[PDB]
Amino acid sequence: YSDRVAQLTIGNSTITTQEAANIIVGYGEWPSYCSDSDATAVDKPTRPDVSVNRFYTLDTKLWEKSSKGWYWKFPDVLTETGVFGQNAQFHYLYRSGFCIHVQCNASKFHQGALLVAVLPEYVIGTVAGGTGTEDSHPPYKQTQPGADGFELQHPYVLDAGIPISQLTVCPHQWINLRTNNCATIIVPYINALPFDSALNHCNFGLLVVPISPLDYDQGATPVIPITITLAPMCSEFAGLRQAVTQ
Amino acid sequence: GDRVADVIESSIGDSVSRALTHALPAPTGQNTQVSSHRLDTGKVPALQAA
């Protein structure tokens, strides 16, 4: 038995890792299907299981020596991907937790540390005209970037007035290049409602941001990519209609 | 006979208002039982006469 060697099998997907930290269970609470006492919709939901509950590789950013960090908004990342997104479009109501496996590996002569974090209801603010006298709002491509994700305007402030200096409150996991090469976060369905639109509302936001900068000598590898992988758990859909998008 | 029968049987003067319906307790909204598919002839809830 060991702590750093792990394997994650969901549906027909499988992730292996030999240099990891222990798995974080979000808020000390495993993802679950919705009870008959929490639910309110009378429709009999579809629980497609294997077809949608599986790992998805959606993006791969290049961690350069001077990067501000990126973020993704869930579950807008999958809405056009796979047979999960198909159910999320034909339906009004959706419910699921995720199994995020951020991954980034380098040599032993590289250094740097990422900060993987899952911040629920990550509302994004705008630079108010530089001076503070403009009630502007972010475009659709900033609040719902989707596949490619979005680069932070400023990383210190989390583009919302809140400090990254205390982001390790909500479920997080560091990727420190000298110890681990991947992070794994399991979150349950975090919402005040038993179901939600999945298109309009975004349950949380994945914040992949470096705090200690990537550095390396004149070695033989300067291209160090971070890759994002996720997998819906206990997925439920209700309120069937026509195919609707963004 | 004595007395006349159409007075003996007669329901004239029946006091209590005959109730066609009684009231049931409803503290909570009605719960919803689980349902499955049904493909039958004769059992037809949707069809009604207003």
Side-chain angles (χ1 to χ4, degrees), chain A residues 61-76:
Chain A
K61 298 308 296 172
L62 296 183
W63 188 7
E64 294 191 11
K65 303 181 64 177
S66 298
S67 314
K68 295 188 172 188
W70 311 261
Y71 63 83
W72 293 260
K73 318 299 289 305
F74 288 65
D76 189 81

PDB file of all heavy atoms in Angstrom, chain A residues 61-76:
ATOM      1  N   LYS A  61      -3.230  23.829 -21.096  1.00  0.00           N
ATOM      2  CA  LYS A  61      -2.539  25.114 -21.139  1.00  0.00           C
ATOM      3  C   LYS A  61      -1.035  24.924 -21.028  1.00  0.00           C
ATOM      4  O   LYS A  61      -0.567  23.954 -20.432  1.00  0.00           O
ATOM      5  CB  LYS A  61      -3.031  26.037 -20.022  1.00  0.00           C
ATOM      6  CG  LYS A  61      -4.506  26.395 -20.104  1.00  0.00           C
ATOM      7  CD  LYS A  61      -4.871  26.934 -21.479  1.00  0.00           C
ATOM      8  CE  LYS A  61      -4.153  28.238 -21.792  1.00  0.00           C
ATOM      9  NZ  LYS A  61      -4.376  28.659 -23.204  1.00  0.00           N
ATOM     10  N   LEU A  62      -0.280  25.850 -21.609  1.00  0.00           N
ATOM     11  CA  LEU A  62       1.173  25.810 -21.516  1.00  0.00           C
ATOM     12  C   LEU A  62       1.661  26.717 -20.393  1.00  0.00           C
ATOM     13  O   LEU A  62       1.587  27.941 -20.490  1.00  0.00           O
ATOM     14  CB  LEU A  62       1.812  26.217 -22.846  1.00  0.00           C
ATOM     15  CG  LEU A  62       1.541  25.284 -24.028  1.00  0.00           C
ATOM     16  CD1 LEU A  62       2.289  25.742 -25.271  1.00  0.00           C
ATOM     17  CD2 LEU A  62       1.909  23.853 -23.675  1.00  0.00           C
ATOM     18  N   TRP A  63       2.152  26.099 -19.325  1.00  0.00           N
ATOM     19  CA  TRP A  63       2.663  26.829 -18.173  1.00  0.00           C
ATOM     20  C   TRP A  63       3.987  27.504 -18.513  1.00  0.00           C
ATOM     21  O   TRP A  63       5.041  26.874 -18.454  1.00  0.00           O
ATOM     22  CB  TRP A  63       2.830  25.877 -16.984  1.00  0.00           C
ATOM     23  CG  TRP A  63       3.181  26.539 -15.681  1.00  0.00           C
ATOM     24  CD1 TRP A  63       3.231  27.879 -15.424  1.00  0.00           C
ATOM     25  CD2 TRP A  63       3.531  25.882 -14.455  1.00  0.00           C
ATOM     26  NE1 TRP A  63       3.593  28.095 -14.114  1.00  0.00           N
ATOM     27  CE2 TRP A  63       3.782  26.886 -13.500  1.00  0.00           C
ATOM     28  CE3 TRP A  63       3.656  24.542 -14.075  1.00  0.00           C
ATOM     29  CZ2 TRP A  63       4.151  26.591 -12.188  1.00  0.00           C
ATOM     30  CZ3 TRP A  63       4.024  24.252 -12.774  1.00  0.00           C
ATOM     31  CH2 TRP A  63       4.265  25.271 -11.845  1.00  0.00           C
ATOM     32  N   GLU A  64       3.927  28.781 -18.878  1.00  0.00           N
ATOM     33  CA  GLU A  64       5.136  29.543 -19.180  1.00  0.00           C
ATOM     34  C   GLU A  64       5.708  30.159 -17.906  1.00  0.00           C
ATOM     35  O   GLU A  64       5.016  30.250 -16.892  1.00  0.00           O
ATOM     36  CB  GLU A  64       4.851  30.630 -20.222  1.00  0.00           C
ATOM     37  CG  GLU A  64       4.469  30.092 -21.597  1.00  0.00           C
ATOM     38  CD  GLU A  64       4.443  31.169 -22.668  1.00  0.00           C
ATOM     39  OE1 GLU A  64       4.917  32.294 -22.398  1.00  0.00           O
ATOM     40  OE2 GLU A  64       3.949  30.890 -23.781  1.00  0.00           O
ATOM     41  N   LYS A  65       6.968  30.585 -17.968  1.00  0.00           N
ATOM     42  CA  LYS A  65       7.690  31.071 -16.791  1.00  0.00           C
ATOM     43  C   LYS A  65       7.054  32.309 -16.160  1.00  0.00           C
ATOM     44  O   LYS A  65       7.346  32.646 -15.013  1.00  0.00           O
ATOM     45  CB  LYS A  65       9.147  31.371 -17.155  1.00  0.00           C
ATOM     46  CG  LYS A  65       9.900  30.183 -17.732  1.00  0.00           C
ATOM     47  CD  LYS A  65      11.350  30.533 -18.041  1.00  0.00           C
ATOM     48  CE  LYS A  65      12.117  30.890 -16.780  1.00  0.00           C
ATOM     49  NZ  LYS A  65      13.553  31.161 -17.063  1.00  0.00           N
ATOM     50  N   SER A  66       6.187  32.982 -16.910  1.00  0.00           N
ATOM     51  CA  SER A  66       5.490  34.157 -16.400  1.00  0.00           C
ATOM     52  C   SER A  66       4.015  34.135 -16.792  1.00  0.00           C
ATOM     53  O   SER A  66       3.590  34.858 -17.694  1.00  0.00           O
ATOM     54  CB  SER A  66       6.154  35.437 -16.911  1.00  0.00           C
ATOM     55  OG  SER A  66       7.491  35.537 -16.451  1.00  0.00           O
ATOM     56  N   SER A  67       3.240  33.300 -16.106  1.00  0.00           N
ATOM     57  CA  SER A  67       1.813  33.162 -16.387  1.00  0.00           C
ATOM     58  C   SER A  67       0.976  33.544 -15.169  1.00  0.00           C
ATOM     59  O   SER A  67       1.358  33.267 -14.033  1.00  0.00           O
ATOM     60  CB  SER A  67       1.490  31.731 -16.820  1.00  0.00           C
ATOM     61  OG  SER A  67       2.420  31.270 -17.784  1.00  0.00           O
ATOM     62  N   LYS A  68      -0.169  34.176 -15.411  1.00  0.00           N
ATOM     63  CA  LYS A  68      -1.011  34.671 -14.326  1.00  0.00           C
ATOM     64  C   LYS A  68      -1.929  33.598 -13.750  1.00  0.00           C
ATOM     65  O   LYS A  68      -2.433  33.738 -12.636  1.00  0.00           O
ATOM     66  CB  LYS A  68      -1.852  35.856 -14.808  1.00  0.00           C
ATOM     67  CG  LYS A  68      -1.040  37.079 -15.197  1.00  0.00           C
ATOM     68  CD  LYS A  68      -1.946  38.263 -15.478  1.00  0.00           C
ATOM     69  CE  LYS A  68      -1.142  39.535 -15.672  1.00  0.00           C
ATOM     70  NZ  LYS A  68      -2.019  40.735 -15.750  1.00  0.00           N
ATOM     71  N   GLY A  69      -2.150  32.532 -14.512  1.00  0.00           N
ATOM     72  CA  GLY A  69      -3.044  31.472 -14.085  1.00  0.00           C
ATOM     73  C   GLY A  69      -4.374  31.534 -14.809  1.00  0.00           C
ATOM     74  O   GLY A  69      -4.774  32.592 -15.299  1.00  0.00           O
ATOM     75  N   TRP A  70      -5.068  30.402 -14.868  1.00  0.00           N
ATOM     76  CA  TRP A  70      -6.305  30.300 -15.634  1.00  0.00           C
ATOM     77  C   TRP A  70      -7.457  29.792 -14.778  1.00  0.00           C
ATOM     78  O   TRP A  70      -7.260  29.390 -13.632  1.00  0.00           O
ATOM     79  CB  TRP A  70      -6.110  29.373 -16.837  1.00  0.00           C
ATOM     80  CG  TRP A  70      -4.891  29.687 -17.647  1.00  0.00           C
ATOM     81  CD1 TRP A  70      -4.840  30.395 -18.811  1.00  0.00           C
ATOM     82  CD2 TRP A  70      -3.543  29.300 -17.351  1.00  0.00           C
ATOM     83  NE1 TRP A  70      -3.543  30.473 -19.259  1.00  0.00           N
ATOM     84  CE2 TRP A  70      -2.728  29.809 -18.379  1.00  0.00           C
ATOM     85  CE3 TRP A  70      -2.947  28.574 -16.317  1.00  0.00           C
ATOM     86  CZ2 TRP A  70      -1.348  29.616 -18.402  1.00  0.00           C
ATOM     87  CZ3 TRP A  70      -1.580  28.383 -16.340  1.00  0.00           C
ATOM     88  CH2 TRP A  70      -0.795  28.901 -17.376  1.00  0.00           C
ATOM     89  N   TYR A  71      -8.662  29.811 -15.340  1.00  0.00           N
ATOM     90  CA  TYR A  71      -9.814  29.230 -14.662  1.00  0.00           C
ATOM     91  C   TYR A  71     -10.840  28.669 -15.640  1.00  0.00           C
ATOM     92  O   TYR A  71     -10.872  29.039 -16.814  1.00  0.00           O
ATOM     93  CB  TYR A  71     -10.486  30.255 -13.740  1.00  0.00           C
ATOM     94  CG  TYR A  71     -11.074  31.465 -14.437  1.00  0.00           C
ATOM     95  CD1 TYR A  71     -12.334  31.417 -15.019  1.00  0.00           C
ATOM     96  CD2 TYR A  71     -10.379  32.664 -14.484  1.00  0.00           C
ATOM     97  CE1 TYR A  71     -12.872  32.521 -15.647  1.00  0.00           C
ATOM     98  CE2 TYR A  71     -10.913  33.775 -15.105  1.00  0.00           C
ATOM     99  CZ  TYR A  71     -12.159  33.699 -15.685  1.00  0.00           C
ATOM    100  OH  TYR A  71     -12.693  34.805 -16.307  1.00  0.00           O
ATOM    101  N   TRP A  72     -11.676  27.768 -15.133  1.00  0.00           N
ATOM    102  CA  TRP A  72     -12.773  27.192 -15.901  1.00  0.00           C
ATOM    103  C   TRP A  72     -14.047  27.233 -15.066  1.00  0.00           C
ATOM    104  O   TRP A  72     -13.987  27.177 -13.839  1.00  0.00           O
ATOM    105  CB  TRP A  72     -12.452  25.754 -16.316  1.00  0.00           C
ATOM    106  CG  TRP A  72     -11.322  25.633 -17.296  1.00  0.00           C
ATOM    107  CD1 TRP A  72     -11.424  25.465 -18.646  1.00  0.00           C
ATOM    108  CD2 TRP A  72      -9.918  25.662 -17.002  1.00  0.00           C
ATOM    109  NE1 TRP A  72     -10.173  25.391 -19.211  1.00  0.00           N
ATOM    110  CE2 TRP A  72      -9.231  25.508 -18.223  1.00  0.00           C
ATOM    111  CE3 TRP A  72      -9.175  25.802 -15.825  1.00  0.00           C
ATOM    112  CZ2 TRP A  72      -7.839  25.493 -18.300  1.00  0.00           C
ATOM    113  CZ3 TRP A  72      -7.794  25.789 -15.905  1.00  0.00           C
ATOM    114  CH2 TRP A  72      -7.141  25.634 -17.133  1.00  0.00           C
ATOM    115  N   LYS A  73     -15.197  27.333 -15.726  1.00  0.00           N
ATOM    116  CA  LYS A  73     -16.470  27.415 -15.016  1.00  0.00           C
ATOM    117  C   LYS A  73     -17.315  26.166 -15.264  1.00  0.00           C
ATOM    118  O   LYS A  73     -17.639  25.839 -16.405  1.00  0.00           O
ATOM    119  CB  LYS A  73     -17.236  28.672 -15.440  1.00  0.00           C
ATOM    120  CG  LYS A  73     -16.368  29.916 -15.573  1.00  0.00           C
ATOM    121  CD  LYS A  73     -15.704  30.306 -14.263  1.00  0.00           C
ATOM    122  CE  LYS A  73     -16.705  30.865 -13.271  1.00  0.00           C
ATOM    123  NZ  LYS A  73     -17.474  32.014 -13.825  1.00  0.00           N
ATOM    124  N   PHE A  74     -17.669  25.472 -14.186  1.00  0.00           N
ATOM    125  CA  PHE A  74     -18.397  24.207 -14.272  1.00  0.00           C
ATOM    126  C   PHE A  74     -19.890  24.408 -14.037  1.00  0.00           C
ATOM    127  O   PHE A  74     -20.274  25.184 -13.169  1.00  0.00           O
ATOM    128  CB  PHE A  74     -17.846  23.208 -13.251  1.00  0.00           C
ATOM    129  CG  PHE A  74     -16.491  22.657 -13.599  1.00  0.00           C
ATOM    130  CD1 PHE A  74     -15.376  23.480 -13.641  1.00  0.00           C
ATOM    131  CD2 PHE A  74     -16.328  21.307 -13.859  1.00  0.00           C
ATOM    132  CE1 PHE A  74     -14.130  22.969 -13.956  1.00  0.00           C
ATOM    133  CE2 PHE A  74     -15.083  20.790 -14.171  1.00  0.00           C
ATOM    134  CZ  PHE A  74     -13.984  21.624 -14.220  1.00  0.00           C
ATOM    135  N   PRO A  75     -20.739  23.676 -14.778  1.00  0.00           N
ATOM    136  CA  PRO A  75     -20.370  22.672 -15.779  1.00  0.00           C
ATOM    137  C   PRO A  75     -20.478  23.166 -17.221  1.00  0.00           C
ATOM    138  O   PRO A  75     -20.971  22.426 -18.071  1.00  0.00           O
ATOM    139  CB  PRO A  75     -21.389  21.565 -15.523  1.00  0.00           C
ATOM    140  CG  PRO A  75     -22.631  22.326 -15.139  1.00  0.00           C
ATOM    141  CD  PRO A  75     -22.179  23.614 -14.467  1.00  0.00           C
ATOM    142  N   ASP A  76     -20.024  24.386 -17.493  1.00  0.00           N
ATOM    143  CA  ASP A  76     -20.093  24.931 -18.846  1.00  0.00           C
ATOM    144  C   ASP A  76     -18.982  24.356 -19.730  1.00  0.00           C
ATOM    145  O   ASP A  76     -18.988  24.536 -20.949  1.00  0.00           O
ATOM    146  CB  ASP A  76     -20.011  26.462 -18.810  1.00  0.00           C
ATOM    147  CG  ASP A  76     -20.293  27.098 -20.161  1.00  0.00           C
ATOM    148  OD1 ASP A  76     -21.482  27.242 -20.518  1.00  0.00           O
ATOM    149  OD2 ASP A  76     -19.326  27.458 -20.865  1.00  0.00           O
TER     150      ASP A  76
END
